[PDB]
Amino acid sequence: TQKVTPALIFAITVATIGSFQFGYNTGVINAPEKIIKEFITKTLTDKGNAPPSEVLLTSLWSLSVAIFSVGGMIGSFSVGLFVNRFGRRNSMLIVNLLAVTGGCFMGLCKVAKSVEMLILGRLVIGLFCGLCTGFVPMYIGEISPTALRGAFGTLNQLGIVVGILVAQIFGLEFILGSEELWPLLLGFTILPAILQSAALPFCPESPRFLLINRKEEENAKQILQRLWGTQDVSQDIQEMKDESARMSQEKQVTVLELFRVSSYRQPIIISIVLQLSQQLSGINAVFYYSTGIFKDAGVQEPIYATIGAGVVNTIFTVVSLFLVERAGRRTLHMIGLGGMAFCSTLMTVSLLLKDNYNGMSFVCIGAILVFVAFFEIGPGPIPWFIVAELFSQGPRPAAMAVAGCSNWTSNFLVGLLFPSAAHYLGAYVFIIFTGFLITFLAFTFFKVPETRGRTFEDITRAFEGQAH
Numbered sequence: 001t002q003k004v005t006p007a008l009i010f011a012i013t014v015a016t017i018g019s020f021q022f023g024y025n026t027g028v029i030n031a032p033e034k035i036i037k038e039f040i041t042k043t044l045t046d047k048g049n050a051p052p053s054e055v056l057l058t059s060l061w062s063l064s065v066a067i068f069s070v071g072g073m074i075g076s077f078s079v080g081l082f083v084n085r086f087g088r089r090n091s092m093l094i095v096n097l098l099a100v101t102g103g104c105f106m107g108l109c110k111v112a113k114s115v116e117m118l119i120l121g122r123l124v125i126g127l128f129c130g131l132c133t134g135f136v137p138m139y140i141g142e143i144s145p146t147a148l149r150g151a152f153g154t155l156n157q158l159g160i161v162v163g164i165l166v167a168q169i170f171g172l173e174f175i176l177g178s179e180e181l182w183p184l185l186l187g188f189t190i191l192p193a194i195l196q197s198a199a200l201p202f203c204p205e206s207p208r209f210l211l212i213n214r215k216e217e218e219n220a221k222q223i224l225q226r227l228w229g230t231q232d233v234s235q236d237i238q239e240m241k242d243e244s245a246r247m248s249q250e251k252q253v254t255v256l257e258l259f260r261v262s263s264y265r266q267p268i269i270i271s272i273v274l275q276l277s278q279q280l281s282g283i284n285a286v287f288y289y290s291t292g293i294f295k296d297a298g299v300q301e302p303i304y305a306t307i308g309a310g311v312v313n314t315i316f317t318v319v320s321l322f323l324v325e326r327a328g329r330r331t332l333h334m335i336g337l338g339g340m341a342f343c344s345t346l347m348t349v350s351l352l353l354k355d356n357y358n359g360m361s362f363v364c365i366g367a368i369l370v371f372v373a374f375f376e377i378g379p380g381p382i383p384w385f386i387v388a389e390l391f392s393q394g395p396r397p398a399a400m401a402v403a404g405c406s407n408w409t410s411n412f413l414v415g416l417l418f419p420s421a422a423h424y425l426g427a428y429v430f431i432i433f434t435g436f437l438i439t440f441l442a443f444t445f446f447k448v449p450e451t452r453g454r455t456f457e458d459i460t461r462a463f464e465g466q467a468h
């Protein structure tokens with residue numbers, strides 16, 4: 001007997017402002033490219049350099065884009081420097097200083113005639129976003145009622161995709177995507193941060209962290225009673241007491257220790273492979289090629305098809321949210337991997353028959369949109385919250401620094417190496433991705449145990465049994 005209280009929904013929603021931040025900053029950079037390149041040309045040339053070549057502009061732009069990922073790699077790997085020392089909620093209150101700072105660098109670089117400020121600002125917003133992708137699932141995972149852990153955990157990915165969609169809408173030239181307003185398109189990131197710092201004082205630190213890491217039992221119990229809307233919180237205080245007992249019997253874990261301890265090695269392998277199943281799914285290739293295929297299919301301003309694909313992107317994230325607690329994690333993730341595997345084959349075949357049987361441009365659009373649906377059914381939301389469920393309280397931060405960093409790093413290497421691969425492979429690049437997908441589908445079938453509705457204590461014991 002536990003309803004969902006307005007206070008619990010408020011807490012998790014405010015935390016997922018971090019997710020919206022990650023989505024917005026990831027997706028905001030593409031639309032203003034040419035406006036910002038003219039800005040770079042004007043800035044240099046007014047400081048007395050010769051006008052930059054295309055080569056130089058491509059170079060400086062590419063650095064603006066990419067230095068975000070470098071920040072995200074670092075930020076996410078450092079989550080373990082914050083969450084135990086400051087607590088989960090307080091950590092969020094602290095790193096908003098980074099968000100406001102990076103948003104100011106980006107938002108002010110034009111009136112300050114500074115290309116360096118734009119780049120610096122993209123790195124600092126990257127550090128911020130990396131810390132977010134680790135803080136938000138840890139908080140959500142630790143305060144959620146056990147039967148709603150994955151559902152609430154899906155709001156993370158929903159926050160991300162909505163952030164992306166809003167970044168693209170704002171980037172329209174009649175909104176903020178203009179030569180006069182692109183600083184506000186970029187600086188916009190400080191408003192959600194300002195909004196989250198105002199609201200975070202009304203969000204409790206999770207009763208789990210309070211009881212387990214700070215041994216504050218009777219104050220954890222009072223938080224719990226309000227979040228749940230009931231006063232019988234008995235089963236659940238002690239399960240937390242069981243985790244507290246468990247944690248005081250364990251040496252807690254460094255990143256290196258995850259890999260030497262045997263009880264951890266397969267949870268951490270599941271954790272990382274699931275991140276690769278997300279970033280090597282082919283989803284990147286689909287967005288890359290997407291704008292090109294649209295223009296080719298008679299859509300003379302293809303940003304609206306990109307926005308339309310974001311709408312689809314959002315729809316099927318909610319679909320997953322409603323399915324994840326009944327269907328399970330295994331089922332939703334493998335449905336995704338196989339559904340994608342089918343679509344990337346149809347893309348290779350479409351593109352190869354394209355200007356010989358001419359209708360194929362629409363076929364390839366159908367495949368792209370069906371791909372996005374299958375991505376959000378499982379491989380999108382699940383890798384972001386599952387790591388929190390595979391570990392007990394003590395190892396969780398280090399585990400989520402590793403899993404989070406491997407998500408950003410694989411994303412970075414993919415964005416780096418794919419243009420070459422596509423150049424030599426052409427349309428056959430969707431066939432290597434079909435090959436990854438089948439392999440990940442195999443991996444999930446044999447290696448990933450079901451975690452839906454199970455306590456941390458019963459998930460951990462099963463991993464310990466197997467290691468025995």
Ligand SMILES: CCCCCCCC/C=C\CCCCCCCC(=O)OC[C@H](O)CO
Pocket residue numbers: 162314315318319322
């Ligand atoms: C701004 C972003 C938001 C965009 C808004 C578009 C989202 C709506 C689209 C699809 C949702 C599917 C509808 C699901 C509603 C009913 C599901 C349900 O109630 O089933 C679960 C139930 O608990 C089992 O017993």
Ligand SMILES: CCCCCCCC/C=C\CCCCCCCC(=O)OC[C@H](O)CO
Pocket residue numbers: 445446447448449450451454458459460461462463466
């Ligand atoms: C019908 C064909 C059979 C398909 C393959 C069936 C074998 C099991 C599959 C995956 C789990 C493999 C590992 C299971 C043990 C891992 C640790 C674990 O069980 O996790 C904790 C569990 O969640 C506590 O509820």
Ligand SMILES: OC[C@H]1O[C@H](O[C@H]2[C@H](O)[C@@H](O)[C@@H](O)O[C@@H]2CO)[C@H](O)[C@@H](O)[C@@H]1O
Pocket residue numbers: 026027157160161164278283284287313380411
């Ligand atoms: O800019 C669009 C964005 O799309 C994909 O973003 C992924 C993201 O990487 C995943 O971590 C996850 O959260 O879902 C997003 C898809 O909605 C690309 O992977 C990303 O590089 C790209 O920028």
